[PDB]
Amino acid sequence: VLKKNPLKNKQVLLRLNPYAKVFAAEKLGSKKAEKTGTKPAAVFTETLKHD
Amino acid sequence: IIQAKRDAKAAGSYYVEAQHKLVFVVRIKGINKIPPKPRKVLQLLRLTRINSGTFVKVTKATLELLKLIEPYVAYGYPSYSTIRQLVYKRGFGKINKQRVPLSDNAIIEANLGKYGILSIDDLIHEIITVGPHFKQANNFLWPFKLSNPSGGWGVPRKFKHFIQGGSFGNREEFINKLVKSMN
Amino acid sequence: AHFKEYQVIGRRLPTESVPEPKLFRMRIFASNEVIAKSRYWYFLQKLHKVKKASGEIVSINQINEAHPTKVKNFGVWVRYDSRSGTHNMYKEIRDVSRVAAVETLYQDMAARHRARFRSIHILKVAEIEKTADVKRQYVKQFLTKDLKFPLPHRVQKSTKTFSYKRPSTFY
Amino acid sequence: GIDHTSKQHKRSGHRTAPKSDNVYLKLLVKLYTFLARRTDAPFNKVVLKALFLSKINRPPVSVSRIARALKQEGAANKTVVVVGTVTDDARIFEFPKTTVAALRFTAGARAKIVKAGGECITLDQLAVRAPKGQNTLILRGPRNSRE
Amino acid sequence: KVYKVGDIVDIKANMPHKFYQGKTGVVYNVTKSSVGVIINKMVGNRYLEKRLNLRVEHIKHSKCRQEFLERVKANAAKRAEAKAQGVAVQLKRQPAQPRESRIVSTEGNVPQTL
Amino acid sequence: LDDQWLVEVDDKVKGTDNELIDPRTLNRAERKRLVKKNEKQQRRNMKN
RNA sequence: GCCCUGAAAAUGGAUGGCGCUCAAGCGUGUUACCUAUACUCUACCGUCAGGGUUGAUGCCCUGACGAGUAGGCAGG
RNA sequence: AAGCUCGUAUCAGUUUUAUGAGUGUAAGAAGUCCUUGUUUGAACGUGGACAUUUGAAUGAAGAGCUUUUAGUGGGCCAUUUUUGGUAAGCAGAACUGGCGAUGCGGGAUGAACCGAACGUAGAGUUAAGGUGCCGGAAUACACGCUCAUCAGACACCACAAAAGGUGUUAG
RNA sequence: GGAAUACUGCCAGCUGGGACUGAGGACUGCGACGUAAGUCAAGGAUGCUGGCAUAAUGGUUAUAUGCCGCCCGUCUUGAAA
Ligand SMILES: [Mg+2]
Ligand SMILES: [Mg+2]
Ligand SMILES: [Mg+2]
Ligand SMILES: [Mg+2]
Ligand SMILES: [Mg+2]
Ligand SMILES: [Mg+2]
Ligand SMILES: [Mg+2]
Ligand SMILES: [Mg+2]
Ligand SMILES: [Mg+2]
């Protein structure tokens, strides 16, 4: 009889997607990435700074 | 994709990402004084009223349609969050020629279960990755009836190209902000 | 809008027996990447015989100012569309950034020459290393040693409709 | 406004209701509407659709035509169903023993059928005997032969 | 160069009726010196049939169905081969797809500024 | 008209057996008929 | 580029008016704001369509639509 | 408006592909395969078979065939092609839009201008146009230009010779 | 050499104020929190309290104020003209 938005209604969100509980519990919306130490090449830097 | 660009830069090369396979198109002009061929293309893309939106698979056959209806639509490349919010809030299914809201996974399982789609998340997956049943899933989705943007269009005059300070044409990644404002 | 500077590197699509086409790089002043790529394809079609459908964009990268908090003098070589043809123009702008100088130049072209963004072509923006190479007086008058000037007739903004004292323009 | 691709408020039609004021005909319409809704029988659908037709679209069916239909192999013991009037024919001299269900029988047709030894029944008796129209043969009279 | 009734031809001049340049139609009449051609022309919201009489040198054979016949033969051959050797085959044409990702190396091809 | 590259076929010629004939040939025949009529009228004027 | 001259009659009157001069003028840029019978959500009316139903040309459920002269059909 | 059928049926003011012209045609049951009869080859055939991976994209629940009649038929305006031009206006063809039959917002006001087409209401957001006061909304912010002894706030056509000026600014 | 910040984008992160609406009328469905019986914001509003109990709200009527509103029918493209 009435349409309820899952983005606002938590019960409807859980009804439509059981994985939302796991997503919220594991905080997958703010997951940290693994740090890498890759450096750009000298040719790339020279091309970027070239006029 | 992030690491592929970093490795290419470290190796002195350039990583070119694959071209977009999906666009989202919203009709921005009304139904008065439309030339016949663009009117026919709008009807073929199911944009029969202002602030109506649809997903289009990007091929050579559809890029020419988008080129034909360029002065009357705003289209771009939707993100996963934009697609998810559109399907969650304004997602409706065409069942027996009726517009039915997608309030349960049983509806989607009953109508698109023969294509392996069992839930709204499966429908979103089939939309975001243009799969073998993209045509059936997209035609099952009723054309999205968006509102006017909540913060305005951001320009004084809408009917110029987005490049020239207007609103129509391909705005690429800014369709996400526009559609989230209109949703 | 607030201009940004990009480098856009593109090429032709690789064909049979002609692999690794030559890469071409341009520096474009634009508000966003869509406008930057549009200007790049426009200039590439104007100079070479390469079309957008026949080529591709290899890279687009925003270039930031090296020392954004240092006052600099810029010589700007530009040309504008006219019926007789392209006419050169040289301007000198004192600013802290190339994008700020470009925005100032576009505002000046709109105010004086009644010119538009798609009509103005930016050829070169060059920082003037030595002050002796500055050759416009409206820039040279600010290079004087120990320059001080006042601001006579100060007008203060009022937030109320009525005031209970006669205003003063002292400073 | 929207740019309509189809006509708005378009009636399907399909002859929903009969135009007659006959109470018994309306009772038959009600009975076969129930049967067509609750049996999924194409025979019931056809009989219900034929109950709505007009007089010019329900031509009479002759007893000689019924006999010619019954002469087919395998149809010698089927019940002949005519949604309309069954008329007599003096051009045929031999009539088989058969059961005929029709809206109306003329006096000569009923006399000929009874003399042959069968029976004439109505559509409600037909519905009671065969609710799914088992072993039935629907006959329609010629249309274009009149002008 | 023999023309028969039912062939598809193109009207190509080697001044009047300049509208029928590049028009494609069906031959209905063949004589010793002239050829009759059927042309369907849009008039209002309907196509009207028109008879055109042309010289021999102003028409030529059309290749409008050549690709279709070749594709029919190729599809028949591929279907027979895939029936003889059981595997999934694709027979329908497809539009051009967007290109995939690639890595462009600046080995000898250092980008140049213009 | 004989050298004209393309001639539209008249709607009045339809329904007759003379449709398959070249309109250029038909017009040449009509011109020859008119010339012979003029010659016959000249001969008649000479006789009278 | 802007400014002045670059021709004007005849009752008293017009950037719509007041008036405006680092404009409330001209060119351009960035935002905020105002409000259509347009768009979005909801209720109600009617129409059409699709289903269900042993006062049944009635009842229940669902969806979408609604400009109009001549003229046509229907219910009052 | 009536009937008979069909209903993955019939399609499309569109794109794609192939092939012409400098926009036309075509894209499968109105098929294809084996087998060698018809007047060593074109063109017509004897019998059998492969289907829901049946022949590009997108959209579409109504389509096809027969009967059956109310009102109307020489209007204006605009855009895009082509031909002839005139003091200057323009004239003759092809095609497509708007209007008459149509209200609503804006352009002060309005037959063709800009938005947008209409059940009765509530709330929100906008279009075009605007935010000194009349008048709902910044005497907002920022860079420049201009002073006219009736500036300008305009239709981008004409006066207009890109003419005249010891006005001003930038090249 | 090591940080920070801007900008852009994401969160099935949290939380405060304001407005309009409350259709439906036993139950059935999809779910959530719980070992559990049970509970719940999950197939559309309930709970507590006050004043009045009549011209108070409301309707009608005469007028005032803000804004809008050209005289109908006919005939002619088109009519205030
Ligand atoms: Mg707001
Ligand atoms: Mg605006
Ligand atoms: Mg004003
Ligand atoms: Mg301004
Ligand atoms: Mg409506
Ligand atoms: Mg005000
Ligand atoms: Mg004058
Ligand atoms: Mg009151
Ligand atoms: Mg008024």
C-alpha gyration radius of chain F: 15
In a domain, D139, yes or no: yes
**How far out from the chain centre does Cα B79 lie?**
10
| Three-state secondary structure readout of E24-77 | EEEEEEECCCEEEEEEEEEECCEEEEEEEEEEHHHEEECCCCHHHHHHHHHHHH
Are C44 and C82 within one domain?
A: no
Task: Say if residue C59 is in the same domain as residue C17.
Answer: yes
Burial of C108 (0-12, 13-18, 19+ CB in 10 A): middle
Q: Which residue is nearest to nucleotide G61 (CA to C1')?
A: A1
Q: Do C27 and A48 make contact, defined as CB atoms within 8 angstroms?
A: no
Interface of C with A in 45-74 (CB under 8 A): 61, 63
Report if CB B180 to strand I is under 7 Å.
Answer: yes
Query: CB-CB: which of C11, C21, C24 is closest to E114?
Result: C24
Check: CB of residue E44 under 8 Å from CB of residue E29: no
Q: Which of F1, F6, F13, F19 to mutate to test the interface with E (most CBs of E within 10 A)?
A: F6
Is residue C157 included in any domain, yes or no? no
In a domain, C118, yes or no: yes
Residues 6+ apart with CB under 8 A from C91: C75, C76, C78, C105, C108, C136
Cα–Cα distance for residue pair D29/D17, rounded to 1 Å: 9
Torsion E92-E96-E100-E102 (CA) sign: positive
Instruction: Look at the block and give the residue holding tokens 């007009």.
Output: D54
Number of domains in chain C: 2
Of C18, C21, C35, whose CA–CA distance to C8 is shortest? C35
Task: Please check whether residue D4 lies inside any domain of the structure.
Answer: no
Query: What distance in Å separates residue E45's CA from the closest CA in chain F?
Result: 21
* Helix, coil or strand: residue C94: strand
Report the distance separating Cα D70 and Cα D129, nearest Å.
19
Gap between the Cα atoms of B135 and B129, Å rounded:
12
Find all residues with CB under 8 Å of B17, minimum gap 6, and list them.
B1, B5, E101
How many structural domains comprise chain D?
1
Contacts of C27 in chain A (CB under 8 A): 51
The CATH number for C94's domain is 3.10.20.10
Looking at residue C110, the DSSP 8-state letter turns out to be: I
Q: In DSSP terms, which residues pair with C127 in a beta bridge?
A: C74
Residue A2: CB atoms within 10 A of its CB come to 5
Cβ-contact D32, D51 below 8 angstroms: yes
Contact call for residues F7 and E20 (beta carbons, < 8 A): no
Residue B139, CA: closest nucleotide via C1'? H59
> Which residues have CB under 8 Å from C10's CB, separation 6+?
C23, C24, C40, C41, C44, C55, C56, C57, C58
Residues C64 and C93 in one domain: no
Quote the minimal CA–CA distance from E110 to chain A in Å.
8
Q: Cα torsion for B64, B67, B72, B73, to the nearest 10°?
A: 80
- Considering the domain architecture, whether residues C80 and C140 belong to the same structural domain is answered as yes
The CA-based diameter of chain F, rounded to the nearest angstrom, is 45
Q: Are residues C103 and C126 in the same domain?
A: yes
What letter represents residue E42's amino acid?
Answer: M
Domain closes at, from C68, C97, C116: C68
Q: What are phi and psi of C143, to 5 degrees?
A: -100, 5
C60 and C78 in a single domain? The answer is no
How far is it, in rounded angstroms, from Cα C126 to Cα C98? 9
In a domain, C64, yes or no: yes
Query: With a 7 Å cutoff on the CB, does A27 touch strand I?
Result: yes
Task: Say if CB B111 and CB B100 are below 8 A apart.
Answer: no
Q: Which domain holds residue D106?
A: 14-145
Q: What are the backbone angles phi and psi of residue C11, rounded to the nearest 5°?
A: -160, 175
Tell me whether residues B12 and A44 touch, CB distance under 8 A: yes
Q: What is the C-alpha separation between D37 and A21, in angstroms, rounded?
A: 47
- Sequence-ordered list of residues with C-beta below 8 angstroms from that of D89, at least 6 positions apart, any chain: D62, D63, D64, D65
* C170 within domain boundaries: no
- E29 to each of B38, E53, E54, how far by Cα in Å? 40, 9, 10
3-class DSSP state of C124: strand
List the one residue out of D73, D70, D147, D74 whose CA is nearest residue D116: D70
Closest C-alpha to D139, from D88, D74, D76, D63: D63
Distance CA F11, CA C50 (A): 53
What is the Cα–Cα distance from B80 to D93, expressed in whole angstroms? 83
User: What Å resolution does this PDB entry report?
Assistant: 2.4
Q: Under a CB-based contact definition with an 8 Å cutoff, are residues C26 and C40 in contact?
A: yes
Q: Return the DSSP state at D143.
A: S
> C13 and chain A: CB distance < 8 Å anywhere?
no
Asked if residue C1 lies in contact with residue C30, where contact means CB atoms within 8 angstroms, the answer is: no
Longest dimension (CA), chain A: 65
Give the CB-side neighbour count of residue B159, counting CA atoms within 13 A.
7
Domain of residue C37: give its range: 2-68
| C86 lies in the same domain as C60 | no
C86 and C48 inside one domain: no
CB contact under 8 A, E53 and F5: no
Q: Which of C74, C111, C76 is CA-nearest to residue C96?
A: C74
CB-side neighbour CA atoms (13 Å) of D80: 32
CA distance C81 to C121: 8
Beta strands E112-113 and C24-30 are: parallel
Rg (CA), chain C: 22
The residue assigned the tokens 């666009």 is: B23
CA distances in angstroms from B119 to B94, D8, D45, D116, listed in the order given = 16, 34, 38, 68
Nearest CA distance, E37 vs chain F (angstrom): 10
| Shared-domain flag, residues C6 and C57 | yes
Q: Are B89 and B81 in contact (CB under 8 A)?
A: no
Q: Say if D9 falls within a structural domain.
A: no
Domain annotation covers residue D6: no
CA of residue E29 to C1' of nucleotide I80, angstroms:
67
- Same domain, residue pair C26 and C37: yes
Do residue C75 and residue C136 come from a single domain?
yes
Q: State whether residue B158 is helix, strand or coil.
A: coil
Residue type, C3: F
Q: What is the 3-state secondary structure (H, E, C) of chain F?
A: CCCCCEEECCCCCCCCHHHHCCHHHHHHHHHHHHHHHHHHHHHHHHHC
Q: What are phi and psi of B111, to 5 degrees?
A: -100, -35
| Cβ-proximal residues to B180 (8 Å cutoff; 6+ apart), any chain | B82, B85
* Experimental method of this PDB entry: cryo-EM
Chain breaks in chain F (C to N over 2.5 A) after: none
Which residue range is the domain that position B31 belongs to? Answer: 1-183
Rounded to the nearest whole angstrom, what is the distance from the C-alpha of residue C51 to the centroid of ligand 9? 59
Query: What CATH number has the domain bearing residue D38?
Result: 3.100.10.10
Query: Using CA atoms, how far apart are residues A47 and C8, in angstroms rounded to an integer?
Result: 11
Tokens linked to E99: 């290109």
Indicate whether C166 belongs to any domain: no
Q: Residue B15 is inside which H or E element, if any? A: strand B13-16
CA distance C141 to B149: 50
Rounded Cα distance between B30 and A12, Å, is 35
Same structural domain, C36 and C74: no
CB E53 within 8 A of CB F6: yes
User: Taking CA atoms, what residue in B is nearest to E100?
Assistant: B18
The maximal CA–CA distance of chain D, rounded, in angstroms, is 71
